[PDB]
Structure 1
Amino acid sequence: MRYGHFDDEAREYVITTPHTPYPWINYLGSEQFFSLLSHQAGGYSFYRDAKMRRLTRYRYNNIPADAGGRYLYVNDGGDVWTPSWLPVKADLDHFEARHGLGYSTITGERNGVRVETLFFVPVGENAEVQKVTVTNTSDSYKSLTLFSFVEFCLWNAQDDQTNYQRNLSIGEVEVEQESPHGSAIYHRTEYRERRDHYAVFAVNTQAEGFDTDRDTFVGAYNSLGEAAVPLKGESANSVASGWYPIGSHSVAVSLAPGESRELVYVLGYVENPDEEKWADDAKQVVNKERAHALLSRFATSEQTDAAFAALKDYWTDLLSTYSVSSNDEKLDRMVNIWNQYQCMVTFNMSRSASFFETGIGRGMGFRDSNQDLLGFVHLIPERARERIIDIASTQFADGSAYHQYQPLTKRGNNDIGSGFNDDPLWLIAGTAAYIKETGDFSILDEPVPFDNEPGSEVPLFEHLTRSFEFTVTHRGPHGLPLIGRADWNDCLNLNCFSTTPGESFQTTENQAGGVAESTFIAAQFVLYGEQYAELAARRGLADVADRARGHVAEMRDALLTDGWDGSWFLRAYDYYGNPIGTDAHDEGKIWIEPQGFAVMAGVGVGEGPQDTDAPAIKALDSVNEMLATDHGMVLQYPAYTTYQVHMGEVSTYPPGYKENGGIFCHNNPWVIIAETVVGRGGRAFDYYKRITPAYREDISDVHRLEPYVYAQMIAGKEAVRHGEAKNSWLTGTAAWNFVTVSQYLLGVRPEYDGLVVDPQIGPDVPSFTVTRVARGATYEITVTNSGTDGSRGRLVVDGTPVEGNLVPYAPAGSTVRVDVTL
């Protein structure tokens, strides 16, 4: 069953009931100020740092979930309800919520009163705006009082939730009932001291009254669903002194039958320079000039409507580089709108805040900065270039990388450190992807320091060299790369040996030395090793490139011998040189990561899909037999049923969840791409559909989470909850799936000298057109597709057949038409 539907014309997901299987969220904000917003108005906002500059408070694992947010209590004759349904849960005659790109609307109607709220963060502003339309849909006169409500956070969310011994005495506000354009509340905790910022919550009309103390508005012993003040029907005009500050205004609204009223509410973040903090000589009254200026820009519905229009323009213009038109509307909506939106949100939000990530931790993986780029580089290439330079600037001189990058300070995380040996090669991955997209080889000459040390600058290219050489110089007894703390699988910790609750599996190493090797890093080195060698050669370093290709060849051989178990690739050798991922064991016989990545790297690929003795086909067939389920491919099989002390976190999960038998949507694409490489498009597209939001929409009761974005993890076949997802939105799954569908299924992918056109998607998509803007030109690519395994496209360019699958890049401004037959 479904709980809504896509509206492709509006580019919205339309949730038609409050009673979803999980809170379904959207993200607002495209610059520095962001909001999380559920279909029940739940969530919170922050400026840049969700740990240290959170404006509003939100409780994770609340009972019930998501029961705090931006609420508007309607009092109609004594009856109090909320359009968001929650928190009051009064019966509504109509409910609808629409999540769009950077905005959402929530509409609730009860007893002849409809309330529509449009929520959005305007471009150019550090604020969340609410455009509220109240309509009297009855045949009687209505006289309403609306009470707004947001609960403030005391900026540092970690302190807010732990240090009550200090913080229940510091909450401060100022109230401005006669604001120039309405009424305003200012939350100013710690402005007294080291803070140069405050929040404003305001409405564009004169409020009847206000409240700033939560205990007074809500009342003792009450939940938000039973808040005393709206029930009494008049604000208490409470002025907070410590405890819990909030923003609430009451607004009187009288409407004849059929009449409506519009109101605009603003939650703003304001900073003043230090010499302008105070209005008064005695330094007691906050300088409100900047806040009044913001409120003046949203004083009318008209200004607000223009602002909303500019946001839609922003997203429309941004998503104008890749689109597809086919027989399959589920495919098209994913490629055209939702997947690309999700990749932008991962750029904007990193791994900070979702309804599973709590916004306290602030970094993301070095590996994920690079992988995310694969998905967003076609949209924001300038920012991509910068991100590459910023993360490369943190790299150590020996080539090792900080495992964790902090995007806000542009530094590596010192506490976590290094030692995850897959990390360095991902920088080659990111850089090459950037250069293929843009043609900007000049990035390789940029001066980039090591560990952010002034004076240490060398060309970015030399950082790639150091990443490459790190792996060469850190190989084990079989010539495979030493794994270190972990590789892409954060839970494969072969140098941990922990028996103490509390020790980090990723950073604890209770034995030193060993010979643990990873076949994942091996495959990664063949793939990105060849990418590095190509860049070196184009750079004119023939010798360096040939030597690199030498090492790459050696690693290919290592994978196909010591790395090969017979019918699939091994996963690793452990600390003592014993194999992991072999049929000789009862559990963990086959692991997905090496099979996908090695075949993407071309390792063991034969003469075609029917060359079934080819190690790549055997491995992929084994994946199909042992790992594939109706909800995607599980990470390994069988899952471990007892703790494997020599392997770290992996076996700590119950069978079927996360890294112990879970379906990692992030790594399924590696196998999808690998199936395109060997020529089995139908199987590739099947696997893509199994895990992709638009195709799972019809089983939303099973997926549980949002039906419009990828999640990290779907429960595997060994779990009672098989098919249920966790960890929506913030995941590398988005990038890898966009790469998969756009570049490998649909087949349109940038190379250094042209655009490759090599569709491999099987019979279910018999004709389609891709429109791709690349290097300033527009390529219109029409494909007629039989879907036959092993059939590859023959190209006709501007009406003339050509050999091969490469279209040399046209001059900017050109339109190039490519007809493909397969």
Structure 2
Amino acid sequence: MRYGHFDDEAREYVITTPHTPYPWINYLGSEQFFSLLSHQAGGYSFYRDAKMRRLTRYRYNNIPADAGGRYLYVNDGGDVWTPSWLPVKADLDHFEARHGLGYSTITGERNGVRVETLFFVPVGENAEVQKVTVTNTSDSYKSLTLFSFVEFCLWNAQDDQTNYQRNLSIGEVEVEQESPHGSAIYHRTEYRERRDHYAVFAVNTQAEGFDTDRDTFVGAYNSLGEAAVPLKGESANSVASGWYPIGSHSVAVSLAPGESRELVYVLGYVENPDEEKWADDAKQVVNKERAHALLSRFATSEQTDAAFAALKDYWTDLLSTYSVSSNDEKLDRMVNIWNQYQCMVTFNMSRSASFFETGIGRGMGFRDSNQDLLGFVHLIPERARERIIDIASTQFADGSAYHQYQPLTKRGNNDIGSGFNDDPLWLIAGTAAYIKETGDFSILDEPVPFDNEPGSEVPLFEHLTRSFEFTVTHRGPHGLPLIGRADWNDCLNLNCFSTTPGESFQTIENQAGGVAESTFIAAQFVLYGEQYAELAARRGLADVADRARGHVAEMRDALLTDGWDGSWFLRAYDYYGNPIGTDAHDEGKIWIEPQGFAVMAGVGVGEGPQDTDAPAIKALDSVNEMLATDHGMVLQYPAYTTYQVHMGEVSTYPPGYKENGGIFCHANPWVIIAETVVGRGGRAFDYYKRITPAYREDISDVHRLEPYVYAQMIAGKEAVRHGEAKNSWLTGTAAWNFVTVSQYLLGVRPEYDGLVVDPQIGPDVPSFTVTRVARGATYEITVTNSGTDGSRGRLVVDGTPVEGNLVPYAPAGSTVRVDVTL
């Protein structure tokens, strides 16, 4: 069944009931200020870093889930309810939530009163704005009191929920009932000491009353659904001192029948230079200038409506670089709106904060963030270029890298492990995708520190050299790269041997030495090793390019000789040089990661799909018999049913879950792309449709999570919950699936010299058009597609048959028309 439906004209997902299988969230903001907002107004907001600057408090694993957030309590002659349904859970006559691009609306109506709240983060603002429209839909007059509500976090989210022994005594606010445009409350915890920032929570009318103390507003022994102040019908005017600061105004509203009233609430992040912090000599009063400035920018409905319209315009421009028109409207929906939109979210937030990721331990992953670029280069290239510099700056001089870094400070840390040997090659992966998209080679010349260290700056191209050489100088006995702590698969820990609990595998000390090798990193070196060689060559460094091609050539032979099991690729060699991922074993015979990535690098590829004997065809066929399920390909098979002490975290998950037999969706695109490489478009599209949101919308009761974005993992076939997703929104899946569908199934992809047009999608999409803006020119590409295996497109360029599948770049301002037959 389903719990909503897409509105494509409006670019929304419409949720038509509060009763979803799980809270379904949207992200607001796309720059430096971000809100997680569920279809029940639950979630929170943070500036730049969800661990370090979290404005509002959110409880994960709450009972019930998502039972805190941005609430508006409506008092109608004693009867109190919330338009978001939760927390009060009063019966409503109408409920609807629309999740849009950077905005959502939530409408709830009861006993002839309707509240619509629009939530968004305005372009160029560090604030979350709410436009509330209250409508009398009844026959007679209405006298209402509205109580806004939000609960502050004390900035440090980790301190906020572990350190009450100090926390309970630092909560400080300032109250401003007569603000120049209404009323505002200031959350200024720790402003007295080191923080130069505070939050403001304001309404654009004179509020009747306020509250800043949670225990007063909610009342003893009470849930947010039983909150006392809204029930008494008048604010308490509480002034927090320690305990739990909140933001809350009451507003009196009288409405004739059919009359509506509009209110604008604002939650802002404000920052004063240290010299400019105090209004007063005594340093007791926050300087409020910048906050008033913000509040004057949203003092009226007109201003709010214009900011909303600017945000539409912003997304319209962003979505204008790639789109498609076909018979398949789910396909179209994903390519044109939701996947590109999700890619923007993953670029900004990485893997740190969702309704699964707690925005505590994880910042920006070195490998996750490089991979996110592949899906974001087309959207905003300038910000993509800057991010590459920031990531490369967390690389060490020996070519090894900080596994992740902190969003606020941009500085690397070892909080979730160090010494993952697959990390360095990803840097090449993102830089090359950026230069193909833009033609901007000048980034190779940007100076970049090692470990953020001044005076260590060398050109970014030299960072890429260190990345290539790191692998070159860390190969094992078979010539395959030494694995280290792990590769892309974080739970493949062959240098660990921990039999005692209490410490994560990701951070636990590793035993030095051994010969543990990785076929995945091997594939990775072949793929990104070439890209690095081609950059060196274009740079004019011919000896360098040739040496590297030599090393790539060698790793290719090593992969086929010592990394090949007979019917598929091996996965690794353990610390003592024993194979992993062989038919010789009873469990974990076949792993997806090497199969997809090796065939993507061209390894084992023969002449046709017809040439079944080619290693790539076998590995892929083995993958279809052993790994593929209705809901996607599982990670390896069979799952391990007992702890493999020499292998780390992988076998610690119950079978069918996560790294042990789960469907990691991120790995799927790799196989799908491989299928297009070997010419089986129909198979490749099928893999695509099984894990793609628009196609799984009709089994929303199985998937459970959002029908409009990719998830990290789906319960695999050895799991009793097979089909159910976890960890939605924040996943490499998004970027990699965009790369897959846009560049290999539809087949329009940037190269340094031209646009390649080489579709491979099968009989299910007989005709389509791609509109692609590249290098300042627009390419209109019409494809007539027979779907046949092994059949690749023949180009006509501006009415004239041409050879090959590459169209060289036209001057900006040009319009090129490409017609493809296959």
TM-score (norm. length: structure 1)? 0.99
Cα offsets for 1:579-636 (capped at 9, x unmatched): 0000010000000000000000010011111110010000000000000000000000
Query: Deviation string for 1:344-397 (max 9, x for gaps)?
Result: 111111222110111112422211111010000011111222222222222222
Gap regions ≥5 residues in structure 2: none
CA apart distance, 1:275? 2.6
Cα offset, 1:183, TM superposition: 1.4
Shifted more, 471-480 versus 763-772: the winner is: 471-480
State the SS of the aligned residue for 1:128. strand
CA distance in 1, matches of 2:564, 2:30: 46
Q: CA deviation at 1:233?
A: 1.1
C-alpha separation between the residues in 2 aligned to 1:17 and 1:645? 47
How much has 1:509 moved relative to structure 2?
4.1
Match of 1:790 in 2: 790
CA distance in 2, matches of 1:719, 1:197: 47
Is 2:428–2:531's contact at 8 Å kept on the other side of the alignment? yes
1:18 maps to what in 2?
A: 18
- Residue deviations 1:9-63 (CA, integer Å, cap 9, x gap): 0000000000000000011112211111000000111111222211111111000
After superposition, what is the alpha-carbon deviation per residue over 1:737-781, rounded to whole angstroms, capped at 9, x for unaligned? 000000000000000100000000000000000000101110000
Distance 1:416 1:139 in 2: 60
The structure-2 alpha-carbon separation of the partners of 1:761 and 1:553, relative to structure 1 and needing over 3 Å to count, comes to same
**Cα contact 2:52–2:408 (8 A) shared by 1:** no
Q: Deviations over 1:617-674 (max 9, x none)?
A: 0000000000000000000000000000000000000000000000001000000000
Q: CA deviation at 1:539?
A: 1.6
Question: Following the alignment from structure 1 to structure 2, what is the Cα–Cα distance between the partners of residues 419 and 170?
Answer: 39
Cα distance in 1 for residues equivalent to 2:352 and 2:745: 31
Q: 1:106 to 1:812 in 2, by over 3 A?
A: same
What is the distance in 2 between the residues matched to 1:595 and 1:8? Answer: 36
Contact kept? 2:57, 2:152, Cα under 8 Å: yes
Residue deviations 1:779-819 (CA, integer Å, cap 9, x gap): 00000000000000000000000000000000111000000
- Residue 30 of structure 1 aligns to a residue whose secondary structure is coil
CA contact (8 A) 2:662 2:715 kept: yes
- 2:338 corresponds in structure 1 to 338
For residue 393 of structure 1, what is the aligned residue in structure 2? 393
Residues 566-587 of structure 1: per-residue CA shift (max 9 Å, x gap)? 1000000101111000001000
Superposed displacement of residue 503, structure 1: 2.5
What CA distance in whole angstroms lies between the structure 2 residues aligned with 1:88 and 1:750? 52
Task: Classify the secondary structure of the residue corresponding to 1:146.
Answer: strand
Q: Distance in 2 between matches of 1:442 and 1:176?
A: 51
Cα deviation digits, residues 486-526 of structure 1 (max 9, x gap):
00000000000001112231233453211111100111111
CA contact (8 A) 1:795 1:801 kept: yes
CA offset at residue 154 of structure 1?
1.2
Q: Judge conservation of contact 2:361–2:415 (CA < 8 Å) in 1.
A: no
Q: Secondary structure of 1:648's partner?
A: coil
| Structure 1 position 273, deviation (Å) | 2.2
Identity %: 100
Residues 58 and 69 in structure 1, CA contact (< 8 A), matched pair in contact too? yes
Larger CA deviation: 208-217 vs 460-469:
460-469
| Preserved CA contact (<8 Å) 1:481 1:518 | yes
Q: Structure 1 94/667 Cα, relative in aligned 2: closer, same or farther at 3 Å? A: same
CA deviation after TM superposition for structure 1 residue 414, in Å: 4.6
Aligned to 2:97: 97
Matches within 5 A, 1:539-558: 539-558=539-558
Checking the alignment, whether the CA contact within 8 Å between 1:15 and 1:39 is kept in structure 2 is yes
State how far apart, in whole Å, the 2-side matches of 1:46 and 1:417 are: 25
Question: 3-state DSSP class of the match of 1:376?
Answer: coil
- The alignment partner of 2:619 has SS state of helix
Contact 1:174–1:186 (8 Å) recurs in 2: yes
Between 1:121-130 and 1:78-87, the stretch displaced more is 121-130
Residues 508, 343 of structure 1: CA spacing in aligned structure 2 closer, same or farther, 3 A cutoff? same
The separation in 2 between residues aligned to 1:359 and 1:642, in whole angstroms, is: 32
CA contact 1:496–1:506 (8 Å) conserved in 2: no
Structure 1's 417 and 652: CA in aligned 2 closer, same or farther, altered over 3 A? Answer: closer
**Conserved? CA contact 1:18–1:95, under 8 Å:** yes
Q: 1:660 to 1:261 in 2, by over 3 A?
A: same
Q: Is the CA contact 2:362–2:416 (under 8 Å) kept in the aligned structure 1?
A: no
471 and 171 in structure 1: CA distance in 2 versus 1, 3 angstrom threshold: same
Residues 476, 516 of structure 1: 8 Å contact kept:
yes
3-state DSSP of counterpart to 1:666: helix
Q: Find the aligned partners of 2:173 and 2:395 in 1 and give their Cα distance.
A: 44
Give a deviation string over 1:441-488, Cα, whole Å, max 9, x none.
122222223223333333222222221111121111111111111000
Q: State whether residues 48 and 407 of structure 2, in contact with CA within 8 Å, keep that contact through their aligned partners in structure 1.
A: no
Distance 1:82 1:415, change over 3 A: closer
Paired residue secondary structure (1:484): coil
**How far does residue 170 in structure 1 lie from its aligned partner after superposition?**
1.6
Moved more, 36-45 or 386-395: 386-395
Q: Structure 1 683/511 Cα, relative in aligned 2: closer, same or farther at 3 Å?
A: same
Following the alignment from structure 1 to structure 2, what is the Cα–Cα distance between the partners of residues 415 and 660?
24
Inter-CA distance 275–453: structure 2 relative to 1 (3 Å threshold): closer
The offset of 1:211, in angstroms, is 1.2
| Cα distance in 1 for residues equivalent to 2:662 and 2:543 | 44
Matched, 1:520 2:511: no
Residue in 2 aligned with 1:406?
A: 406
Larger CA deviation: 310-319 vs 652-661: 310-319
Residue 743 of structure 1 contacts residue 749 of structure 1 at CA under 8 Å; is this kept in 2? yes
Relative to 1, partners in 2 of residues 1:772 and 1:577: Cα closer, same or farther, differing over 3 Å? same
Report Cα offsets for 1:509-565 as digits up to 9, x if no partner: 453211111100111111111111111111222222222111111111111121111
Provide TM-score, normalisation by structure 2: 0.99
The offset of 1:282, in angstroms, is 2.5
Counterpart Cα distance in 2 of 1:423 and 1:802: 40
Choose 136-145 or 784-793, whichever is displaced more.
Answer: 136-145
What does 1:600-639 correspond to in 2, within 5 Å? 600-639=600-639
Q: Contact (CA 8 Å) 2:757, 2:805: kept in 1 or not? A: yes
Pair 3,358 (structure 1): closer, same or farther in 2 beyond 3 Å: same
Is the deviation greater in 506-515 or in 7-16?
506-515
Which secondary structure does the structure 2 equivalent of 1:561 belong to? helix
Contact 1:485 1:507 in 2 (8 A): no
Change (3 A) 1:415 1:208: closer
Q: Give, in whole Å, the separation in 1 of the partners of 2:781 and 2:36.
A: 38
After TM superposition, the structure 1 stretch with the greater mean CA deviation from structure 2, 19-28 or 46-55, is 46-55
1:509 and 1:155, CA in 2 relative to 1: closer, same or farther beyond 3 A? closer
Aligned residue for 2:666, secondary structure, equals coil
Q: Could you tell me how far apart the structure 2 residues matched to 1:734 and 1:328 are?
A: 20
User: Contact (CA 8 Å) 1:30, 1:348: kept in 2 or not?
Assistant: yes
SS in structure 1 of the partner of residue 649 of structure 2: helix
CA distance in structure 1 between the aligned counterparts of 2:749 and 2:547, rounded to whole angstroms:
27
Separation in structure 2 between the aligned mates of residue 286 and residue 408 of structure 1, nearest angstrom: 23
Contact 1:400-1:418 at 8 Å conserved across structures: no
Residues 665 and 713 in structure 1, CA contact (< 8 A), matched pair in contact too: yes
- Indicate conservation of the 8 Å contact 2:349/2:364, yes or no: no
Q: 1:526–1:601: 8 Å Cα contact kept in structure 2?
A: yes
CA contact (8 A) 1:480 1:555 kept: yes
Deviation at 1:417, TM superposition (A): 6.1
- Which deviates more, 484-493 or 511-520? 511-520
Residue 476 of structure 2 corresponds to residue 476 of structure 1: yes
- Report the CA distance between 1:708 and its aligned residue: 0.5
Q: Is the 8 A contact 1:49 1:362 kept in 2?
A: no
- Deviation sequence 1:385-422 (CA, Å, 0-9, x none): 22222222222222112222333322221555642111
- The Cα offsets for residues 95-147 of structure 1, whole Å up to 9 and x where unpaired, read as 00000000000000111101000001111211111100000111121111111
Q: Is there any run of 5+ residues in structure 1 with no aligned partner, and where?
A: none
1:73-107 Cα deviation digits (max 9, x unpaired): 11111111000000000000100000000000000
* Distance of 2:53 and 2:365 partners within structure 1: 22
Per-residue CA deviation, residues 318-369 of structure 1 (Å, 9 max, x unaligned), is 1211001111110011001100010111111122211011111242221111
Range 418-427 or range 641-650, more displaced: 418-427
Separation in structure 1 between the aligned mates of residue 507 and residue 19 of structure 2, nearest angstrom: 42
In structure 2, how many angstroms separate the alpha carbons of the residues matched to 1:199 and 1:453? Answer: 33
User: Contact conserved, 2:415 with 2:507, CA < 8 A, in 1?
Assistant: no
